[PDB]
Structures are given as structure tokens and as C-alpha cells.
Design a protein around this ligand. Structure first.
Ligand SMILES: N=C(N)NCCCC[C@H](N)C(=O)O
Ligand SMILES: N=C(N)NCCCC[C@H](N)C(=O)O
Ligand SMILES: [Fe+3]
Ligand SMILES: [Fe+3]
Lengths: 339, 341
């Protein structure tokens, strides 16, 4: 599909209008995921430039979308200061305005959510390289390519969109993207992948090793159960003409003794690996990946750990907040796994 | 003639009804936007309009949008009611004698406005087997159908139900825009108060121990419809968080699993509870309601239809929070008609 990547390059006025609105939010509210801001977020998002809202709406209803990319948001590199050395330190005063702007864009597509078991239950999260995590399977890696995945593939409450706001990317490190062409894998493999014949485990970002030590053990019970005793699930669902994709290259296995399944997965892993194409998010670029249609990852790179490294703000978006109420503390709470 | 909004309780449901009263300027602003849409787009449910509807809805009055957004995220809502839209009765002309004659030029502006309000809550959808798959449908009494199980009845009660209770693609909201209602005829509404029901019955209702068959109203999809009647899947009536459970039941079309006497008992306990808990919402001309179909059943009282062009007439719509989830039951990405393919 020629519009699988939908791009909007902001005019100077559109960039300035979006920055003014984000700065007005930072003037009013404490955190870019403060409860009062999130209650207000859908309507405040309506104040984004009309031409931009029109293109975001076209992307939202495009069921073959890979990513919407909004290029050319204002990012003041000097005002922003150094790239923090850990996501725990990345809730900086100077970066608030970019968290608010990410939530405003995201709220055109759905409702923002976070995870009790990821980055201490923050809704606005950070992607930056961490010294000692170079060879990890988590988004703070650098030397080892981030393996392609559906975000939170293990969960029925996985996002419909993953939002990425690039604050800085001096070495032009690519985000990787791939969809599935059913015609190129075969009706045979599609049929197998549509069967509940696979195990998808929570990735390592959901482990207590990637959260603050004080975070409640109760939050992690469900994750540990999903690692030990994964449910039998499909990789494909929906219409045969526009099927949804759910798979993590490093956390997905066929159910024991299902050689057909093991072979379908093997064939899917080889097909997605080669199809993987590059999208570079420069400073001020906001992307929304359709997590129903594509797997994504990140090319290997050398981090400098000198305060100049690549830094994204990130958010999960659901089309339907109500559906996850069983996993949320209360109606307005956005943190999946607090119930 | 000033803006107001407020919470109207029913039993223990403290936000059951969220009521908004449009100021005269807000009513005029909403009417002007609907009239501009009617000048720029062919139909209230044409592809050209529905591609834009969610963005054009952002042009509705800001104070109204803030209150509708609070209703959208209230998981205990029964009905959002927006009162005081402009309806020109003289220009509207008579209530048509059948929905097949009800998609009138004079009434198009109210179809556009219903879709604009609806598009603040989600994406509009229709049903292949209902009013020729129209997304904006018509509720009016039809002569010779006074005694029926459908919304064109009058003399007999329209039994309460979750809208399309049998379907995994059932709406999140049912929208109603009243064009005329001279005799103040009500929609009936009930939710479950779990503090009025034995916890054992509530536990049974969460079990997949019931058959919700479609009405006679309702191909891979239509193979699913025959299966739904002949080999109905075991489904729950309650689902989700115990503090905010969703409800899915049809007073005329729900039974327990074969030989599950305990489920048959819990079902009948729930039917008697909801029947006793029914209250009413009356929409005057220019009043719009959105029922949260996840939380409430609805129906309609007997009323005295005259079939003289003066009868009660609503525009009606279904809204989904998640259009993508039904793609297997829609013709193409943008098509809004469930069961079309
Ligand atoms: N195949 C792999 N590596 N899957 C895990 C990807 C990392 C995603 C996680 N939310 C994070 O931000 O770390
Ligand atoms: N319990 C009952 N009566 N269930 C059937 C109701 C039919 C509703 C349909 N949307 C209509 O407008 O006719
Ligand atoms: Fe990811
Ligand atoms: Fe109904």
C-alpha cells in the first residue's frame, strides 16, 4: 500500500501552533500524564492545527496503516539539556513540553495507557540507551538490534498504536517496521497462524529488573504467570483481506508438539526479518505505529553516553479504554495491571 | 436560555444520566455546522462525510465537547442527554409512514447533527439486515405493525434489551435524536445494581452459561447468524471488572445452557431485577440521548400512534469505540455496515 507510511510535514505556523498548545498544557498541569490533563486531553487535542487533525484522522481509519509520521515539531536542543543516563532520570523539567505534545497527538487516535510493570507505571515513557544494557532485549539497548515485535504482544490489552516522539537522534538511527503480506507467506501458513497454536511471553521490560526496586511485587505476579504458563494464542486475527498481526521475534514459540505451527512461525520470522524497512525519526518527528498491522524494532548503534545520545518519548494508545477496565484500578486510571 | 450540565441519579447509579442543556448560541452553532455539512456532503452516512466526521465533530461547542468527553470515559454512565438543539417543525414536514420513506431532504440536517455528536463518542456503524444497512436509521410508528417486537411498534411495549445482544460487534452507544414527540413518549432504560442482587446469581451471570439468539431481524457472516440460532455459543451476561461490569442480555431472546437449571434461575432473577429497575428518558424535539449499551438495556412503553404525520419520530445511530475490531464483518476498511461482508 503506497500510503502505508502517511507523512505530514508541519509548516512553521503548524509547528509553532502545536508548541504553543503543549507549552499551555505545561503551564497548567504538573506531569504530561497527570490525571487532570488526561481527562482534558481528548478536547485539548482538538486545538491542534486542523490540516494536521485531518491527516491524523485519515491514518486512524486506514486499516492498512504501518505508521503516521508528523515531521518538523519544534525541539529546542539547548533548552532540552543532556540525554539522561536512565529512563528513571528522564522525567526532566525541560522535556515536559514534549511529553504533553506526544499525549495531545496520541489523543487524536485513542486513549493513552501505561503498564504497572513497565517504567514504574509511567504513561509517557522514555527510549534512550543505558550503559550496561547495550546487549539487552529492551529499548535501552544500542549495540544489539532491538528485535522486531508487536508492543506487549503477550497481552490482550496491547496498544493499537505506539507513539514515538524523537527529541534527538544525531546518528540518524532507524526504527524498523514490517507488515505481513498474506499472499507472500501462503494461504497454508496464514491458516496455521490464525490458529491458537502459539505461546507469546511478556518481554523483559515487564520484569522487576527493569523497574524501581520499591515497586509492588503484586504488579509482577501476572507477568511471571504469563512467562511460566502462556495461553495458546493466534498470531493473525480479523478479516483474511486485512489481518492483524501479533508476534514478538524473541518471545514467541509454537505450542509443544505442533510441527506445522513451529514451521509457520519459522517461515513468518524469516519473511518479517527481510521485509523489515527503516524509518528515521529526526528531532521533532512524531510517529504512530499501527500495532495491529506492523512489528517494529531499532537498528544497532554505538551510544556515546556523553549526554548527546538518541532520546524518544513514547506512549501506548488504545482505541477502546473501556475494554481493559478489568485490568485498571478505576475508571480514569490508565495503568494496565493495577487490577 | 443559558448553558447548564449536571448529574441525575437513578437508584445507586450517581452518574446514571449526564444532562447537558445547550445555550441558544450553542444550539445555533451546532445547527450551522450540521447545515454546512449538508451543503458539502451527499449524505449523513456517505463515505466522504464519515471520513471527516470525527474532525468536523471538533467544531461543536467546546463546553459541550468537554461534557461529552466526561460522559465517554464514565464507565457507569446509563444515558448522556444533550437537550435544546434547533428543530424547525414547519420545515421538517410530517412524520413519514414508514422508515423506507423517512430519509427525507428536510430531515437530512438532523442526521448530520446526530452523526457529529455521535462521532465525539466513537465511530458510527449500521447493520446489513436493519433498515437496508442505513447508519442513520428512523424510529417511527408503522400502521399495521402496532403489535410487533421492533421499534416501529406503538400499542405494545418494546421489551427491554441490550442493542444486538447476540453480536460480538454490538454497539457501545445507541444514539437517539428526537425530531418530534408531542405526547412525551419515553425510552425505557435499566442497569444492574449488583448491591440489589444475590452475589451467587452475579457469579452465575459472569459464567459462559447462556444463549443470546438474534431476533428474526438478523455468506461467512450469515453462516454465523444461522449458527448463532441453531448452535448458539455459551456466552456470559456480565463481563469485566466486578466494580464496573458490562451487561449483555435480551429479555425476549436469552436462555440458559441446556440442562443448566442454576443459570436459568440466575437469568430469571436478573430479568425480574431489570424489569423492576426500568426508568424512562423522554426526548423532546431537539433532545439527543446516547445510551451506554455496555451498561444498560432499553425499550419503549406502549403509546397511542395516530398515523396522521404527527407521530413521534427519532433519528437513531449505533456507535462503536473500536471500528477496527469488526473489520471481519465489514465490506472494506471505511464501510460501516456490519454483516455486509
Ligand atoms: N524482541 C524483543 N526484543 N522484544 C522486546 C521489545 C522491547 C519492548 C519493550 N516495551 C521495551 O521498551 O523495552
Ligand atoms: N426484546 C426485544 N423486543 N428485542 C428486539 C428489539 C429490536 C430492536 C431493533 N434495533 C429495532 O429497532 O427494531
Ligand atoms: Fe516496541
Ligand atoms: Fe433498541
Amino acid at each position: 500500500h503506497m500510503t502505508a507510511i502517511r507523512e505530514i510535514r508541519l509548516s512553521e505556523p503548524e509547528s509553532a501552533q502545536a508548541a504553543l498548545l503543549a507549552l499551555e498544557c505545561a503551564q497548567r498541569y504538573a506531569e504530561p500524564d497527570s490525571a487532570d490533563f488526561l481527562a482534558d486531553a481528548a478536547v485539548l487535542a482538538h486545538d491542534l492545527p486542523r490540516a494536521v487533525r485531518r491527516e491524523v484522522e485519515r491514518a486512524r481509519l486506514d486499516d492498512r496503516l504501518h505508521a503516521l509520521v508528523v515531521r518538523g515539531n519544534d525541539v529546542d536542543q539547548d533548552a532540552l539539556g543532556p540525554t539522561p543516563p536512565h529512563w528513571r532520570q528522564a522525567r526532566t523539567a525541560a522535556s515536559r513540553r514534549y511529553g504533553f505534545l506526544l499525549v495531545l497527538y496520541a489523543s487524536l487516535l485513542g486513549d493513552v495507557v501505561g503498564w504497572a510493570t513497565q517504567q514504574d507505571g509511567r504513561v509517557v515513557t522514555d527510549v534512550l540507551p543505558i550503559e550496561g544494557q547495550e546487549d539487552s532485549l529492551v529499548s535501552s539497548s544500542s549495540s544489539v538490534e532491538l528485535g522486531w515485535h508487536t508492543e506487549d504482544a503477550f497481552s490482550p490489552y496491547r496498544a493499537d498504536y505506539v507513539g514515538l516522539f524523537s527529541l534527538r537522534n544525531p546518528d540518524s538511527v532507524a526504527t524498523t517496521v514490517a507488515g505481513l503480506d498474506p499472499d507472500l507467506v501462503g494461504p497454508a501458513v496464514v491458516d496455521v497462524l490464525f490458529g491458537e497454536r502459539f505461546h507469546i511471553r511478556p518481554d523483559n521490560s515487564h520484569l522487576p529488573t527493569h523497574n524501581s526496586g520499591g515497586r509492588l511485587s503484586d504488579y509482577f505476579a501476572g507477568i511471571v504467570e504469563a512467562v511460566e504458563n502462556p495461553r495458546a494464542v493466534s498470531i493473525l486475527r480479523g478479516h483474511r483481506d486485512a489481518p492483524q498481526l501479533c508476534v514478538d521475534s524473541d518471545f514467541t514459540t509454537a505450542v509443544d508438539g505442533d510441527a506445522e505451527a513451529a514451521g509457520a512461525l519459522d517461515t513468518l520470522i524469516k519473511h518479517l526479518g527481510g521485509a523489515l524497512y527503516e524509518v528515521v525519526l529526526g528531532p521533532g518527528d512524531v510517529a504512530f505505529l499501527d500495532n495491529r498491522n506492523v512489528v517494529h524494532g531499532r537498528r544497532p548503534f554505538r551510544a556515546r553516553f556523553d549526554g548527546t545520545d538518541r532520546w524518544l518519548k513514547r506512549i501506548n494508545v488504545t482505541a477502546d479504554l473501556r475494554k481493559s477496565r478489568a485490568a485498571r484500578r478505576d475508571a480514569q486510571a490508565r495503568v494496565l495491571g493495577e487490577a
